[PDB]
């Protein structure tokens, strides 16, 4: 069985939920995890003892003053006059949501220093992070998505002037998770606040149509060798297992697979879909879902181990 | 009076060209360049004496046994008797072509470490490094490109089957730059050679129609504040330089005028450039490479770190650089 390393924290709007994921993965992985590496907002790495990996320790994480590590080839590094002490780290699991983990910075940085990992690489991160780019990627793959307007602080007034709006619609930043800046607009006075709130998260905002009580379906999965290993379908807002045709389930899996291509190799991704007049629409790609969507897999621990092992790793 | 570091080398097929780029900019910029940072194929950072910046020294570089520095917040980590000593870097000029400068990796490292730089950020790097991604980006912007077929290894044996246009073809890696692995294919005898030779440089190959008698024009430039600062138009294959017409003339012409393209065409080249460099290349000096087919402007590619930062295409490059440096937040 593979030894692991869990990376979490990050300079991110999803910092706090990253710690939840890593704490969740502790219950799943237990002893399989050699190291717990915390990445704080100032971009310092710290080693956390397995006994300290709980909510109480992290609320008071400042006072603690841990000794900052510096990333280097094959692992982590501590300095003194005597030289550099190198902690050689095993296959790391990127559990940093948003910010550094999903925008491509960490994929680049881990890849730079030849540290093997589970998570989206640079291209996969960039395209899944920016929703506008996700739309172009999907479009090219013949996978449907909701029509949209991409706005920025510049064209803001120009594009919305002389306009008689067709309500409702949904306003969201071009690149963020957990719905941090996402508001529904039903009337024109509701618009300013929706746009201002979404611009607090991103230079660019996406306006899409709103259709309430539409079917939402989430599928997690990864590629191991030449086959795919899927999770159960989630019905995220309902209320466990989701009720679906064999044929719908199969449409979702087909879409997932086109999306994943070779881009998302080495990652456990969840694609979120809409079903409108029973057509499948791609909502988004979460290449680092909360707790790696472990609770949606029949045998997550074995799926992980199977993926880890199929990696062409080589330090 | 801004100072720069020049970062060059890298794990790139264009490693040698990057060294040439840094020697050229030494020549141009001089001792504004406070530091010269070498990155080798094994990803160690070395500091190099300005006096050692030349072909002869780099021809033997692998034996000079230099002391590797480690990148960290605000610069490079050196050790002393007092422990970690930080060498703070002035604005770095990313001159690592191709692998590691143009693929998003060094952009992420410098951003991660709060190290100010001139060059493409992460999205710009990614979107301009992968020629298939550039094709998708150009399309959404309304910019013309040649049609193509994208090939994998698990799929390359089906090449002719998937082709939706005729011979002749031009075959090229998805991401290699510097005319590396590029072959013109006239007939499917030559196709197996062109393919296995470009798959030497990438997991993906792009196939395009080869079209004869196409005008090639390259345009370099950057955004400074709310204005573009353009270079001369390069014609890579004659090696002549054509510049733009001014409607706001402040001199009387006393000689036979100089060799320019039409007002319409100069305008299109600039328009394609601006919409391409949108907000995604802010902080970079890029060269877009265009084809003109029957009067139309098509994009061949975006090069966010051109060779020698395309400095010989600018009127005053030091002033252009400096003003870009100044405008950065």
DSSP characters for B58-86? HHTGGGS----BEEETTEEEEEETTEEEE
* Residue among B49, B109, B158 nearest A43 (CA): B109
CA distance linking residue B295 with residue B152, whole number of Å: 34
Residues A205 and A218 in one domain: no
Does A109 contact B109 at a Cβ distance shorter than 8 Å? yes
Residues A175 and A224 in one domain: no
The tokens for A26 are 């502790």
The tokens for A5 are 């390393």
A chain contacts of residue B127, beta-carbon cutoff 8 Å: 126, 133
Query: Across-strand partners of B93?
Result: B6, B118
Buried b (16+ CB within 10 A) or exposed e, A151-175: beeeeeeeeeeeeeeeeebbbbbbb
User: Mutation test of the interface with chain B: which of A108, A115, A226, choosing the one with the most B Cβ atoms within 10 A?
Assistant: A108
Write the CA distances from B180 to A249, B171, B186, B204, integer angstroms: 44, 10, 19, 13
Residues 6+ apart with CB under 8 A from B243: B232, B233, B258, B260
For B108, the closest of A77, A81, A108 (CB atoms) is A108
User: Is A312 within 8 Å of chain B by CB?
Assistant: no
CA distance A42 to chain B (A): 9
CA distance linking residue B320 with residue B31, whole number of Å: 17
Does B77 contact A83 at a Cβ distance shorter than 8 Å? no
Query: Across-strand partners of B184?
Result: B170
Does B126 contact A104 at a Cβ distance shorter than 8 Å? yes
Please count the residue pairs, one from chain A and one from chain B, whose beta carbons lie less than 8 angstroms apart.
Answer: 78
φ, ψ of residue B288 in degrees (nearest 5)? -85, 135
Buried b (16+ CB within 10 A) or exposed e, A47-70: bbeeeebeeeebeebeeeeeebbb
User: Is A260 within 8 Å of chain B by CB?
Assistant: no
Write the CA distances from B62 to A8, A203, B58, B66, B188, integer angstroms: 38, 44, 8, 9, 42
Starting at the earlier edge strand, list the strands of the sheet with B215-224. Answer: B240-242, B227-235, B215-224, B286-293, B296-303
Residues A137 and A278 in one domain: yes
CA distance linking residue B167 with residue B220, whole number of Å: 32
Does B82 contact A81 at a Cβ distance shorter than 8 Å? yes
B chain contacts of residue A140, beta-carbon cutoff 8 Å: 136
CA distance linking residue B289 with residue A107, whole number of Å: 29
Does A111 contact B122 at a Cβ distance shorter than 8 Å? no
Does B133 contact A111 at a Cβ distance shorter than 8 Å? no
In the DSSP assignment, the letter for residue B194 is H
User: Is B145 within 8 Å of chain A by CB?
Assistant: no
Experimental method for this entry?
X-ray
* Residue among B290, B322, B285 nearest B306 (CA): B285
CA distance B41 to chain A (A): 11
A156: number of CA atoms within 13 Å, CB side? Answer: 14
* Residue among B195, B183, B212 nearest B294 (CA): B212
- Determine the residue of chain A that is closest to B140 in CA distance: A136
Buried b (16+ CB within 10 A) or exposed e, A207-236: bbeeeeeebbbbbbbbbbeeeebbbbbbee
Q: What is the dihedral of CA B314, B315, B318, B324, to 10 degrees?
A: -60
Q: How far apart are the first and last CA of chain A?
A: 18
Q: Count other C-beta atoms under 10 Å from residue A95's C-beta.
A: 29
Residues B126 and B273 in one domain: yes
Does B104 contact A103 at a Cβ distance shorter than 8 Å? no
Residue B198 sits in a domain whose CATH number is 3.30.1490.20
Contact A92, A115 (CB under 8 A): yes
For A105, the closest of B100, B108, B133 (CB atoms) is B108
Residues 6+ apart with CB under 8 A from A97: A10, A12, A14, A17, A18, A21, A177, A178, A288, A290
* Residue among A179, A186, A220 nearest A303 (CA): A220
CA distance linking residue A216 with residue A283, whole number of Å: 9
The tokens for A286 are 């979460």
User: Mutation test of the interface with chain B: which of A12, A67, A105, choosing the one with the most B Cβ atoms within 10 A?
Assistant: A105
Residues A129 and A277 in one domain: yes
Contact A119, A287 (CB under 8 A): yes
Angle at the Cα of A185 from the Cα atoms of A180 and A191, rounded to 5 degrees: 90
Buried b (16+ CB within 10 A) or exposed e, B39-75: bbeebbbbbbeeeebeeeebeebeeeebeebbbbbeb
User: Is A100 within 8 Å of chain B by CB?
Assistant: yes
Per the structure, how many domains does chain A have?
3
CA distance linking residue B288 with residue B268, whole number of Å: 12
CA distance A105 to chain B (A): 5
* Contact residues, A window 45-84, toward B, CB-based 8 Å cutoff: 70, 72-73, 77, 79-81, 83-84
Residue A291 sits in a domain whose CATH number is 3.30.470.20
CA distance A153 to chain B (A): 12
Write the CA distances from A237 to A216, A219, A234, integer angstroms: 8, 14, 9
For B111, the closest of A77, A105, A203 (CB atoms) is A105
B chain contacts of residue A109, beta-carbon cutoff 8 Å: 105, 108-109, 112
Residues B172 and B23 in one domain: no
The tokens for B62 are 């692998």
Pairing of strands B169-173, B205-209: antiparallel
Write the CA distances from A101 to A105, A162, B255, B292, integer angstroms: 7, 40, 60, 41
Does B83 contact A83 at a Cβ distance shorter than 8 Å? no
Cis peptide before B168 (omega within 30 of 0): yes
Angle at the Cα of A110 from the Cα atoms of A284 and A301, rounded to 5 degrees: 65
Residues A142 and A193 in one domain: no
Coil/strand/helix, residue B44: coil
| Helix B105-112 × helix A105-112 angle, to 10° | 100
Alpha-carbon B248 to chain mean position: 32
User: Mutation test of the interface with chain A: which of B67, B68, B77, B108, choosing the one with the most A Cβ atoms within 10 A?
Assistant: B108
CA distance B127 to chain A (A): 9
A chain contacts of residue B43, beta-carbon cutoff 8 Å: 73, 112-114
Residue span of the structural domain in which A43 resides: 1-119
Q: Three-class SS string for chain A?
A: CCCEEEEEECCCCCHHHHHHHHHHHHHHHHHHEEEEEEECCCCCEEEECHHHCCHHHHHCHHHHCCCCEEEECCEEEEEECCEEEEEECCCEEECCCCHHHHCCHHHHHHHHCCCCEECCCHHHHHHHHCHHHHHHHHHHCCCECCCCEEEECCCHHHHHCCCCCCCCEEEEECCCCCCCCCEEECCCHHHHHHHHHHHCCCCEEEEEECCCCCEEEEEEEEEECCEEEECCCECCCCCCCCCCCHHHHHHHHHHHHHHHCCCCCCCCEEEEEEEECCEEEEEEEECCCHHHHHHHCCCHHHHHHHHHHHCCCCC
Residues B132 and B237 in one domain: yes
User: Is A2 within 8 Å of chain B by CB?
Assistant: no
Q: Which residue has the tokens 């030494």?
A: B26
Element holding B197 (H helix, E strand):
helix B191-198
Residue B28 sits in a domain whose CATH number is 3.40.50.20
Contact B95, B8 (CB under 8 A): yes
Coil/strand/helix, residue B123: helix
CA distance linking residue A252 with residue A90, whole number of Å: 34
Residues 6+ apart with CB under 8 A from A165: A188, A191
Residues B234 and B161 in one domain: no
The tokens for A310 are 């199929």
Residues 6+ apart with CB under 8 A from B95: B6, B7, B8, B18, B21, B22, B25, B101, B305, B309
CA distance B317 to chain A (A): 29
CA distance linking residue A266 with residue A230, whole number of Å: 14
User: Mutation test of the interface with chain B: which of A77, A120, A122, choosing the one with the most B Cβ atoms within 10 A?
Assistant: A122
Angle at the Cα of A127 from the Cα atoms of A287 and B299, rounded to 5 degrees: 165
Burial class (CB in 10 A: 0-12, 13-18, 19+), B183: middle
Q: Which residue has the tokens 């197996």?
A: B192
Query: Across-strand partners of B79?
Result: B84
Residues B305 and B199 in one domain: no
Residue by residue, DSSP assigns B228-295 as EEEEEEEETTTTEEE----SS--S---S-------HHHHHHHHHHHHHHHTTTSTT--EEEEEEEETT
Query: Across-strand partners of A224?
Result: A227
CA distance linking residue B125 with residue B302, whole number of Å: 10
B chain contacts of residue A94, beta-carbon cutoff 8 Å: none
User: Is B278 within 8 Å of chain A by CB?
Assistant: no
CA distance linking residue A177 with residue A188, whole number of Å: 25
Pairing of strands B92-94, B117-118: parallel
Q: Count other C-beta atoms under 10 Å from residue A31's C-beta.
A: 8
Residues B56 and B95 in one domain: yes
CA distance linking residue B97 with residue B22, whole number of Å: 11
CA distance linking residue A33 with residue B254, whole number of Å: 79
Q: Which residue has the tokens 């601006």?
A: B274
Cis peptide before A168 (omega within 30 of 0): yes
| Cα-only R_g, chain A | 21
CA distance B18 to chain A (A): 18
The tokens for B323 are 């003003």
- Reading phi first (left if > 0) and then psi (alpha if -120 to 50, else beta), residue A119 is in left
Contact A46, A68 (CB under 8 A): yes
- Determine the residue of chain B that is closest to A262 in CA distance: B152
CA distance linking residue A12 with residue A175, whole number of Å: 12
CA distance linking residue B176 with residue B181, whole number of Å: 8
Angle at the Cα of B90 from the Cα atoms of B84 and B95, rounded to 5 degrees: 105
The tokens for A109 are 């940085």
In the DSSP assignment, the letter for residue B144 is B
* Residue among B265, B211, B203, B201 nearest B233 (CA): B265
- Which residue, B119, B135, B155, sits at the end of a domain? B119
Element holding B303 (H helix, E strand):
strand B296-303
**Dihedral (CA of A158, A164, A165, A166) sign:** negative
Residues A232 and A95 in one domain: no
Write the CA distances from A60 to A52, A66, A170, A184, B83, integer angstroms: 11, 12, 37, 36, 29
CA distance linking residue A70 with residue A121, whole number of Å: 21
The tokens for B174 are 């998805």
User: Is A3 within 8 Å of chain B by CB?
Assistant: no
- Determine the residue of chain B that is closest to A138 in CA distance: B136
Coil/strand/helix, residue B53: coil
A chain contacts of residue B133, beta-carbon cutoff 8 Å: 123
């Amino acid at each position: 069985h593979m030894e692991f390393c869990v990376l979490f924290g990050g300079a991110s709007f999803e910092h706090e939920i990253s710690i939840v994921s890593a704490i969740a993965l502790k219950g799943v992985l237990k002893d399989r995890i050699k190291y717990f590496i915390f990445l704080d907002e100032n971009h310092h790495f710290y080693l956390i003892e397995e006994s300290n990996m709980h909510s109480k320790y992290f609320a008071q994480i400042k006072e603690k003053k841990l000794p900052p590590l510096i990333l280097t080839h094959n692992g982590l590094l501590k300095n003194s006059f005597l030289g550099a002490k190198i902690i050689e780290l095993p296959l790391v699991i990127n559990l940093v949501h948003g910010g550094d983990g999903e925008d491509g910075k960490l994929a680049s940085l881990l890849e730079f220093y030849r540290i093997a990992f589970i998570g989206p690489r640079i291209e996969a991160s960039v395209l899944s992070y920016n929703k506008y780019l996700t739309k172009l990627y999907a479009k090219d793959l013949g996978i449907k998505t909701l029509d949209y307007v991409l706005l920025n602080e510049k064209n803001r007034a120009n594009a919305l002037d002389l306009m008689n709006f067709n309500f409702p619609f949904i306003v969201k930043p071009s690149n963020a998770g957990s719905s941090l800046g996402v508001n529904v607009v039903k009337e024109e006075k509701e618009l300013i606040y929706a746009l201002d709130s979404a611009f607090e998260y991103s230079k660019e905002v996406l306006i899409e149509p709103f259709i309430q009580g539409v079917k939402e379906y989430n599928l997690a999965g990864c590629k191991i060798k030449k086959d795919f290993c899927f999770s159960y379908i989630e019905e995220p807002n309902k209320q466990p297992k989701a009720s679906l045709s064999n044929a719908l389930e199969e449409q979702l899996k087909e879409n997932f697979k086109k999306l994943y291509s070779d881009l998302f190799d080495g990652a456990i991704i969840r694609c979120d879909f809409f079903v409108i007049e029973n057509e499948v629409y791609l909502n988004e790609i979460n290449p680092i879902p909360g707790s790696l969507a472990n609770y949606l897999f029949d045998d997550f621990k074995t799926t992980l181990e199977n993926l880890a092992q199929s990696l062409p790793k080589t330090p």
